Ligand binder design. Structure first.
Ligand SMILES: CCCCCCCCCCCCCCCCCC(=O)OC[C@H](CO[C@@H]1O[C@H](CO[C@H]2O[C@H](CO)[C@H](O)[C@H](O)[C@H]2O)[C@H](O)[C@H](O)[C@H]1O)OC(=O)CCCCCCCCCCCCCCCCC
Ligand SMILES: CCCCCCCCCCCCCCCCCC(=O)OC[C@H](CO[C@@H]1O[C@H](CO[C@H]2O[C@H](CO)[C@H](O)[C@H](O)[C@H]2O)[C@H](O)[C@H](O)[C@H]1O)OC(=O)CCCCCCCCCCCCCCCCC
Ligand code: CLA
Ligand code: CLA
Ligand code: CLA
Ligand code: CLA
Ligand code: CLA
Ligand SMILES: CC1=C(/C=C/C(C)=C/C=C/C(C)=C/C=C/C=C(C)/C=C/C=C(C)/C=C/C2=C(C)CCCC2(C)C)C(C)(C)CCC1
Ligand SMILES: CC1=C(/C=C/C(C)=C/C=C/C(C)=C/C=C/C=C(C)/C=C/C=C(C)/C=C/C2=C(C)CCCC2(C)C)C(C)(C)CCC1
Ligand SMILES: CC1=C(/C=C/C(C)=C/C=C/C(C)=C/C=C/C=C(C)/C=C/C=C(C)/C=C/C2=C(C)CCCC2(C)C)C(C)(C)CCC1
Ligand SMILES: CC1=C(/C=C/C(C)=C/C=C/C(C)=C/C=C/C=C(C)/C=C/C=C(C)/C=C/C2=C(C)CCCC2(C)C)C(C)(C)CCC1
Ligand code: OEX
Ligand SMILES: [Cl-]
Ligand SMILES: [Cl-]
Ligand SMILES: [Fe+2]
Lengths: 36, 37, 30, 341, 36, 451, 50, 334, 62, 30
């Protein structure tokens, strides 16, 4: 059960870091009009 | 209760809390006065 | 037999979703 | 130029409130169903028919007033004011339930009037009459619920009464006696009503959020000219948005708006059909296979069995007062009850 | 024909409806239907 | 005609306050006048509560939500939460109401007569929303003000009378706090707790030392952050991450307030330390646990061996084990075994409720509190019929916890909608397509077909 | 049930009989004068203009 | 470019058949986990002790259900609001007995659906669209939060959350009515105005556009073929529809601004569903519907029943029978 | 001075009421910006003083 | 009495409209 718990913490953490860094990587500029 | 000194204002105290919402209504009287420009 | 039937029909719907999205008539700007 | 043609000219004059020939049916009957409901909820009791107060005059509020159905003992009497029950006595007509049939029958003819009005105005102006056709679903609901359903039962007593809390009681009666939630016709109706709300909201939001910029203002409402030729929003961008969000999307403006007529209209029709079955107690009450297992296997429990225990409590706890003419006397010891409650 | 300004009849009509409905809510606690 | 109509401001009357976005002085007026309304209501409402207050009745039978806040700070109350002097409530009331007039005055001065824009009057008070430096400066100052306010609570608790402490020995009392908790292992341990059953994240704080210590940390953090933002401007990663405009800042704050509304909702629903049940009524869990105690007490008095009484399901009628073994009250209330409260903890030993203590040490004051709390469970109708939905009219009661939770959930939810509204709008405005799609340059037309 | 459905058939073919002329759509050169208010004293009758 | 920036352009690409996006990076995993668990559970999960009284309710097709009676059953009342992941169980068998799959499904689902709302915002920004479709989805999303999260918070147990099942949904509705008189609650009455009205206006707008389609086709072809995707001109005479609908009611009861009309269509059902969502969320804190039980009495003080009292008689039948083995004390306080 | 308290306090009330209407009207007429900017001053001074008066007299009557 | 409370709110309540009214008469700056 310990192994499933660790695996899920790592998975969730991986995806949450993607979400956060993704939106920090200049998200406002990714639109079709003005690149600020 | 209020201290007996203030008792006579009990009915004014009784109505004061509704006064902030009249401000909201009053903006509508105002805008209708200016025709909702 | 009835459990198989319910799941069968459910399974046909999921396949229909797949075809309906990925093999729709493409909307063309004509 | 006969008198018929001159009357036709005047009935179809362009005026603030169009009349037409349909108006000769619509305005008297609508006004009388309205007026009769207002009168009865303001001033009239349900004491002799139901054992209930039902007017403001008795101190009911807007949620609890009703024009209540007549006594079971009237059967399906038309309850004419000049008929054998009331014998022309207005006061006693009010007391026996006359206003319920008064409203129910004038309202049915007013609904006919309104649909005829839709046909009438549609023909005069030059448009196809799909609005009339869609209005068939309200008519089907009203006719199956208020006329057919009681006609299959013992009497008008079991139709809905005209009031807010009276209709809720209807609702719950249908759960406890008919298991109406389990009925696939009602489910289809639910899907068409919720689905129609869904469509309503998603179409309006989509269009509001793919407007072209057709004016310089932050208020985007002034940049629409009704005579303009051009779509006011982008179908093309809307279709791409939903195709990528949801996987499919409308591409045909006409199909889309026909779909919008179809969904809610078809839903109401389906529920109408289920209610006709309930006129006959032709219910989807049970699942035989579940009952056969449950009866032999005291450890078999499902949400279906739990709900029927609820139905049984509704029936026993509500029958004596809801159906007073039955003189149900239920001693405490027969009332179904779980532990403690 | 047109002299009394619209905003004034609105305000007056508006206060008039407030009073009639306010009275109805008063009555929900007094006399018939108050449970007392 | 400086804005003030749709033609010049581009905004309709029903979006009229959006005509103020770049009129810092009139905007200042709108904010100060609004502050006056907040402070007015705190005044007028407290005075109303005082006029309607009967000290012999429990506060929670009287529809009071502000007096309970004052009493929690230790003014006007003594042992057991009994009211001993109402003068302080009058004082809080009057001083806010007087104060509301000076705010009012300055709001209407700035809204109607003052400069419409502050920037030509004064470079310290005027501001451009796009000035990242001025914005963190103002942010910085208000941080400082908030830090000061958290410390005024500390002042109240250590130096000016203490606080009401429902957990105080002998059934509760105002108590001066002398050893606040500064260990950051406790203080920030609260933030890392799970928000789920039996943990409850920061809502589980159950002693005034932790309360007063956390407000020492927050005071200094806010003061330090304020200085930080007065002395700095934002870094590059932050500049590229955010929209820098008036509406964007508004939408960030709406997000924040919405989050805070939901936390407060849960605070007043579960927490019986800073929302003492003496003042606000039992919590939902408290009332449900209190009913199991009541019938435990009743039956045990009649001769029932409550530890061995098997109920209908095979579980114990009065007592069972939680899923980790603790002895808890039986029945549906099995869900509420996480509850803790000063009337119940005396019966608690290391395995949960102690049967010897149950058999020997229940005092009459616990029987009283348990009956009091069962009959003031926070259930009731919108027209304040107390009880379950099927109860008959008679009892005129809805728990202030119900009133405070429901009102603040509704507000938190709408403020979340506000957030999405203005966040999305501030995004599209900054890229320049909030008014619509440009027909000559429709982006999608330049993109390849999906299929 | 069939009587109630057939009511819908009645309305459907009723409407198609009486509106056959516009069943495929309304007149693509319809005038705003026939549908806007006041212009014809009698609705949909052009002989009554003004 | 660099690897990170290659990934970033792909995530946010407007060229993918289904848009991913940053919200999508969270939505896709959580929805997949929720969907997979739900399907396996609905077919095969053994019975769940929903009410904590060692009385397992059977929810799955293999244990004797059909499509209508079947459900993923809420987690045990013994657990209350405690978090019960798989790894807190001593075995999957324990986890199944106590209703673990419900928690896993709803938490992954609420999280996936919230990201679905944000993803609607996200793609609207890449496409150059106005941003507020997601505000409309917020009405159904909020309603899902009410029945899966908020109502269990206020009552202290996910066991009183809505079951994931057709009949379990009805169980939930009936018992809600017993315990809160939701029918008598104005926020729910607003929900019905919202959804009845939504359907009404849906039929209306469809019927009126459909009535005023410009003739563009012969009687043998579908009239739908007179609209061509992307065409610049409109396919119906809104002026004709206003002239019909203005006369059916009166001229000023009828829209002739399309933008105003479609905003009404958005607003009415979204506001109404917001209110009913809020209705469930405030009854979660036991602020219930109007109670007019024994509100009319006569000059002596006999109770003169109204229709509210008849409703109460049915509510009491629901109350005394729901969860019939679960109460040992006379008030059902949560 | 139980009657002198209620004097001040009704004076205070009366003067609040006069200023609730006068101050916003004064402010939005530019015809009397200077006719009345002394009156808001006198009024404002009057007002704060009554609060103080009623605040000290409270402690000899309450 | 209740007549007290109503006369206060009658007075308080006509206060707002009266400002708008005076500023319109005095052709003020609404
Ligand atoms: C679609 C668009 C709709 C447009 C809207 C138009 C609305 C128009 C107004 C509708 C008029 C409805 C009046 C019907 C009254 C009714 O029927 O009144 C009922 C009477 C029958 O009377 C009932 O009869 C019952 C049976 O009695 C018989 O049985 C007993 C044996 O136990 C005794 O012998 C008794 O004497 C004997 O009469 C009981 O006596 C009831 O108390 C008594 O009410 O029939 C009669 O008038 C007529 C019976 C002939 C049927 C005529 C068709 C009407 C019903 C169609 C729906 C029926 C199918 C629905 C499912 C059912
Ligand atoms: C950007 C933001 C990013 C966020 C993403 C991560 C989100 C994860 C958090 C999910 C929260 C849901 C679970 C909360 C369940 C619950 O038990 O939450 C309540 C908990 C409180 O927990 C309770 O707290 C209690 C603490 O009191 C204890 O201590 C007290 C001391 O006085 C008393 O003694 C009391 O008796 C004693 O029991 C106990 O611990 C209970 O067992 C425990 O259940 O509150 C909380 O942690 C605080 C409140 C959390 C907010 C509520 C959720 C917000 C609602 C979302 C609405 C969205 C709307 C969508 C619109 C579309
Ligand atoms: C009202 C309060 C407030 C507001 C609105 C801001 C706003 C801002 N601050 Mg300031 N700050 C404040 C209070 C505030 N601060 C206080 C009180 C302190 C004292 C500690 C600081 C210390 C501080 C520093 C040191 C810095 C800022 C910075 C910033 C900017 C970026 C913030 C950011 O990226 O969001 C947060 C967004 C993130 C992406 C961060 C990661 C968020 C994760 C996902 C959440 C969890 C981590 C969280 C930060 C704390 C965890 C607690 C845990 C135990 C539960 C922005 C102008 C930055 C800047 O530009 O400096 C000028 C910067 O470097 N602030
Ligand atoms: C559109 C108008 C309209 C319609 C459809 C109805 C319809 C109805 N009303 Mg309402 N009513 C109306 C207007 C209308 N009313 C008005 C204006 C009032 C206020 C004065 C009322 C007041 C009222 C009351 C108080 C009551 C009704 C009742 C009724 C019901 C029974 C009517 C009945 O038995 O008639 C029988 C009469 C006829 C069918 C008319 C006879 C028609 C012809 C002339 C017969 C002879 C034909 C001849 C051989 C050939 C002639 C050919 C031609 C070329 C000349 C029915 C639902 C009753 C009800 O609802 O009870 C539950 C009831 O008690 N009505
Ligand atoms: C908290 C509520 C609040 C506040 C503080 C404001 C504040 C403001 N609004 Mg907004 N507004 C609101 C609600 C609010 N509004 C609502 C609900 C609506 C929708 C109807 C609007 C619609 C709206 C529009 C359409 C416009 C504003 C404008 C303005 C600004 C100038 C108003 C003006 O010129 O007045 C002129 C009015 C008067 C001179 C009439 C009297 C005004 C005063 C304030 C009466 C109050 C008396 C009060 C009792 C004070 C005395 C007490 C004192 C002794 C202590 C001002 C900053 C305007 C703007 O942006 O300017 C560019 C504008 O065009 N607002
Ligand atoms: C967070 C806000 C909040 C909360 C929790 C309460 C809660 C309470 N108030 Mg207070 N109150 C508030 C704001 C609030 N009020 C404001 C702003 C005012 C000024 C109008 C008052 C004025 C006031 C008076 C005058 C009285 C109370 C009383 C009460 C009690 C009974 C409420 C009742 O019967 O509601 C009835 C419920 C409604 C009318 C429904 C309102 C909900 C609206 C229509 C929908 C939400 C709107 C928005 C879009 C979201 C209760 C303890 C009473 C009491 O017992 O005094 C001791 C009392 O007489 N309050
Ligand atoms: C957010 C609050 C706020 C802000 C930022 C401003 C800002 C401004 N006001 Mg305004 N004003 C406000 C509130 C506010 N005011 C209030 C509440 C009133 C009612 C009295 C007024 C009444 C007012 C008038 C009548 C005038 C201004 C003027 C001005 C300008 C210069 C004022 C100045 O330099 O004084 C310098 C002030 C100081 C050096 C400090 C003394 C000020 C007080 C006593 C300090 C108190 C600090 C206190 C602890 C803060 C917390 C209080 C409470 C909330 C706890 C400036 C743009 C003037 C202007 O623009 O005219 C053209 C002007 O004539 N204001
Ligand atoms: C029946 C009958 C008849 C007839 C009658 C009539 C025709 C009646 C009418 C009546 C009417 C015709 C009535 C009316 C009434 C009304 C009312 C009663 C109203 C009320 C209202 C209200 C109360 C509302 C209010 C409001 C609200 C609530 C909210 C918003 C605002 C407003 C204002 C809208 C006859 C003779 C044949 C005989 C036989 C029987
Ligand atoms: C801007 C604007 C607005 C807003 C406004 C505002 C919000 C204002 C504020 C206002 C304010 C905020 C005010 C205040 C006032 C106050 C007062 C005036 C006070 C007084 C007091 C007194 C005088 C007292 C007395 C007493 C005592 C001491 C004791 C007890 C008894 C008594 C209570 C009697 C509007 C929307 C309209 C419109 C547009 C513009
Ligand atoms: C007083 C007190 C206390 C304490 C408290 C504390 C110590 C607090 C802390 C607090 C904290 C420390 C908090 C924090 C916060 C955080 C937040 C809330 C965050 C957020 C963030 C955001 C929102 C972001 C976003 C984003 C992303 C993620 C990406 C990029 C873009 C953006 C930026 C949009 C205690 C409990 C002991 C007790 C009682 C009293
Ligand atoms: C604290 C105090 C005080 C103060 C007070 C005040 C601050 C007041 C204010 C007041 C106010 C602030 C009021 C106002 C009023 C308002 C009103 C009364 C309005 C109403 C409205 C309406 C009626 C509306 C209508 C309309 C229109 C106009 C348009 C659209 C439609 C409608 C219908 C919505 C005094 C001095 C007493 C002294 C004692 C203490
Ligand atoms: O789990 Mn489902 O439900 Ca809401 O109350 Mn208490 O808990 Mn049970 O009984 Mn009735
Ligand atoms: Cl149940
Ligand atoms: Cl129990
Ligand atoms: Fe449309």
């Amino acid at each position: 059960m310990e192994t499933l718990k660790i695996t899920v913490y790592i998975v969730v953490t991986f995806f949450v870091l993607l979400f956060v860094f993704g939106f920090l990587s200049g998200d406002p500029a990714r639109n079709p009009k003005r690149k600020d | 209760k209020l201290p007996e000194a203030y008792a006579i204002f009990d009915p004014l105290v009784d109505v004061l809390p509704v006064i902030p919402v009249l401000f909201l209504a009053l903006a509508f009287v105002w805008q209708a006065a200016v025709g909702f420009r | 037999m009835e459990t198989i039937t319910y799941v069968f029909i459910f399974a046909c719907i999921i396949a229909l979703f797949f075809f309906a999205i990925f093999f729709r008539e493409p909307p063309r700007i004509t | 130029r006969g008198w018929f043609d001159i009357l036709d000219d005047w009935l179809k004059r362009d005026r603030f409130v169009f009349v037409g020939w349909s108006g000769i049916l619509l305005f008297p009957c609508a006004y009388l169903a309205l007026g009769g409901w207002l009168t009865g909820t303001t001033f009239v009791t349900s004491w002799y028919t139901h054992g209930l107060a039902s007017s403001y005059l008795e101190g009911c509020n807007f949620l609890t007033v009703a024009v209540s159905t007549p006594a079971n003992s009237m059967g399906h009497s038309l309850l004419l004011l000049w008929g054998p029950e009331a014998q022309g006595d207005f006061t006693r007509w009010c007391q026996l339930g006359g206003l319920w049939t008064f409203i129910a029958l004038h309202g049915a003819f007013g609904l006919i009037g309104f649909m005829l009005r839709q046909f009438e105005i549609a023909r005069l102006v030059g448009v196809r009459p799909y609005n009339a056709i869609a209005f068939s679903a309200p008519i089907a609901v009203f006719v199956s619920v208020f006329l057919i359903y009681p006609l299959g039962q013992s009497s008008w007593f079991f139709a809905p009464s005209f009031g807010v809390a009276a209709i809720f009681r209807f609702l719950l009666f249908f759960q406890g006696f008919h298991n109406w939630t389990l009925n696939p016709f009602h489910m289809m109706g639910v899907a068409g009503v919720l689905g129609g709300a869904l469509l309503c909201a998603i179409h309006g939001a989509t269009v509001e959020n793919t407007l072209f910029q057709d004016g310089e203002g932050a208020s985007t409402f002034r940049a629409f000219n009704p005579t303009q030729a051009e779509e006011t929003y982008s179908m093309v961008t809307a279709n791409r948005f939903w195709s990528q969000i949801f996987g499919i999307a409308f591409s045909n403006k006409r199909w889309l708006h026909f779909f919008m007529l179809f969904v809610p209209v078809t839903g109401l029709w389906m529920s109408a059909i289920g209610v006709v079955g309930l006129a006959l107690n032709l219910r989807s009450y049970d699942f035989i296979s579940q009952e056969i297992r449950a009866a032999e296997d005291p450890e078999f429990e499902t949400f279906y069995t739990k709900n029927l225990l609820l139905n049984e409590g509704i029936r026993a706890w509500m029958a004596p007062q809801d159906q007073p003419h039955e003189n149900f006397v239920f001693p405490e010891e027969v009332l179904p009850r779980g532990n403690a409650l | 024909g047109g002299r009394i300004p619209l905003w004034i009849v609105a305000t007056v009509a508006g206060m008039g409806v407030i009073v009639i409905v306010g009275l109805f809510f008063y009555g929900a606690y007094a006399g018939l239907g108050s449970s007392l | 005609a400086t804005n003030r109509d749709q033609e010049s401001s581009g905004f309709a009357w029903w979006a009229g306050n959006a005509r103020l976005i770049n009129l810092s002085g009139k905007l200042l007026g709108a904010h100060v006048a609004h502050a006056g309304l907040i402070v007015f209501w705190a005044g007028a409402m407290t005075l109303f509560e005082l006029a309607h207050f009967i000290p012999e009745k429990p506060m929670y039978e009287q529809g009071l939500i502000l007096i309970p806040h004052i009493a929690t700070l230790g003014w006007g109350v003594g042992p057991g939460g009994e009211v001993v002097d109402t003068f302080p409530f009058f004082v809080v009331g009057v001083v806010h109401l007087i104060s509301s007039a000076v705010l009012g005055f300055g709001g209407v001065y700035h809204a109607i007569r003052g400069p419409e824009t502050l920037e030509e009057y004064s470079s310290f008070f005027g501001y451009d929303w796009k000035d990242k430096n001025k914005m963190t400066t103002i942010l910085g100052f208000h941080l400082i003000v908030l830090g000061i306010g958290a410390l005024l609570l500390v002042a109240k608790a250590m130096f000016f009378g203490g606080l009401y402490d429902t957990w105080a020995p002998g059934g509760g009392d105002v108590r001066v706090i002398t050893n606040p908790t500064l260990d950051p292992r406790v203080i920030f341990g609260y933030l890392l707790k799970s928000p789920f059953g039996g943990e409850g994240w920061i809502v589980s704080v159950n002693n005034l030392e932790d309360v007063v210590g956390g407000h020492i940390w927050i005071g200094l953090i806010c003061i330090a952050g304020g200085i930080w933002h007065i002395l700095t401007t934002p870094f590059g990663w932050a500049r590229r991450a955010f929209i820098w405009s008036g509406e964007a800042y508004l939408s960030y704050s709406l997000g924040a307030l919405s989050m805070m509304g939901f936390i407060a909702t849960c605070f007043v629903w579960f927490n019986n330390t800073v929302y003492p049940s003496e003042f606000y009524g039992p919590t939902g869990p408290e009332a449900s646990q209190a009913q199991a105690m009541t019938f435990l007490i009743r039956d045990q008095k009649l001769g029932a061996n409550v530890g061995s009484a098997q109920g209908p399901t095979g579980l114990g009628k009065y007592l069972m084990r939680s899923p980790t073994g603790e002895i808890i009250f039986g029945g549906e209330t099995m869900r509420f075994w996480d509850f803790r409260g000063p009337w119940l903890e005396p019966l608690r030993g290391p395995n949960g409720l102690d049967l010897n203590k149950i058999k020997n040490d229940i005092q009459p004051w616990q029987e009283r509190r348990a009956a009091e709390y069962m009959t003031h469970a926070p259930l009731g109708s919108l027209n304040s019929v107390g009880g379950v939905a099927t109860e008959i009219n008679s009892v005129n009661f809805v728990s202030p916890r119900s009133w405070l939770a429901t009102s603040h959930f509704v507000l938190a939810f709408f403020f979340l909608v506000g957030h999405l509204w203005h966040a999305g709008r501030a995004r599209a405005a900054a890229a320049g397509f909030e008014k619509g799609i440009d027909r000559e340059s429709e982006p999608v037309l330049s993109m390849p077909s999906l299929d | 049930v069939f009587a109630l459905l057939f009511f819908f058939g009645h309305i459907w073919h009723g409407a198609r009989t009486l509106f056959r002329d516009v069943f495929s759509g309304i007149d693509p050169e319809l005038s705003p004068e026939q549908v806007e208010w006041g212009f014809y004293q009698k609705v949909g009758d052009v002989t009554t203009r003004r | 470019a660099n690897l990170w920036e290659r990934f970033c352009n792909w995530v946010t690409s407007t060229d993918n058949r289904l848009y991913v996006g940053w919200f999508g990076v969270i939505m896709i995993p959580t929805l997949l986990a929720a969907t997979i668990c739900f399907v396996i559970a609905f077919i095969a999960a053994p019975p769940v002790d929903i009410d904590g009284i060692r009385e397992p309710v059977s929810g799955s097709l293999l244990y004797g259900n059909n499509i209508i009676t079947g459900a993923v059953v809420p987690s045990s009342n013994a657990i209350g609001l405690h978090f019960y992941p798989i790894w807190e169980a001593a075995s999957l068998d324990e986890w199944l007995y106590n209703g673990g799959p419900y928690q896993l499904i709803i938490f992954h689902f609420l999280l996936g659906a919230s990201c679905y709302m944000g993803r609607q915002w996200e793609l609207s920004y890449r496409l150059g669209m106005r941003p507020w479709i997601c505000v409309a989805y917020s009405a159904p999303l909020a309603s899902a939060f009410a029945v899966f999260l908020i109502y269990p918070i206020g009552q202290g147990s996910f066991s009183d959350g809505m079951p994931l099942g057709i009949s379990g949904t009805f169980n939930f509705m009936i018992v809600f009515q017993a315990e809160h008189n939701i029918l008598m609650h104005p926020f729910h009455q607003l929900g019905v105005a919202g959804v009845f009205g939504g359907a009404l206006f849906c039929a209306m707008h469809g019927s009126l556009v459909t009535s005023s389609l410009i003739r563009e086709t012969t009687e043998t072809e579908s009239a739908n073929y007179g609209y061509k995707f992307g065409q610049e001109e409109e396919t119906y005479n809104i002026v004709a529809a206003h002239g019909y609908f203005g006369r059916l009611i009166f001229q000023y009861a009828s829209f002739n601004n399309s933008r105003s009309l479609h905003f009404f269509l958005a607003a009415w059902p979204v506001v109404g569903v917001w209110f009913t969502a809020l209705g469930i969320s405030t009854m979660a804190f036991n602020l219930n519907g109007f109670n007019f039980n024994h509100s009319v009495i006569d000059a002596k003080g006999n109770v003169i029943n109204t229709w509210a009292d008849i409703i109460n008689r049915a509510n009491l039948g629901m109350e005394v029978m729901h969860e019939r083995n679960a109460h040992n004390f006379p008030l059902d306080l949560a | 001075m139980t009657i002198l308290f209620q004097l001040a306090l009704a004076a205070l009330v009366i003067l609040s009421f006069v200023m609730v209407i006068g101050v916003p009207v004064a402010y939005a007429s530019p015809q009397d910006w200077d006719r009345s900017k002394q009156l808001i001053f006198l009024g404002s001074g009057l007002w704060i003083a009554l609060v103080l008066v009623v605040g000290v007299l409270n402690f000899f009557v309450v | 009495e209740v007549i007290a409370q109503l006369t206060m709110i009658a007075m308080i309540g006509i206060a707002g409209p009266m400002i708008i009214f005076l500023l319109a008469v005095r052709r003020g700056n609404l």
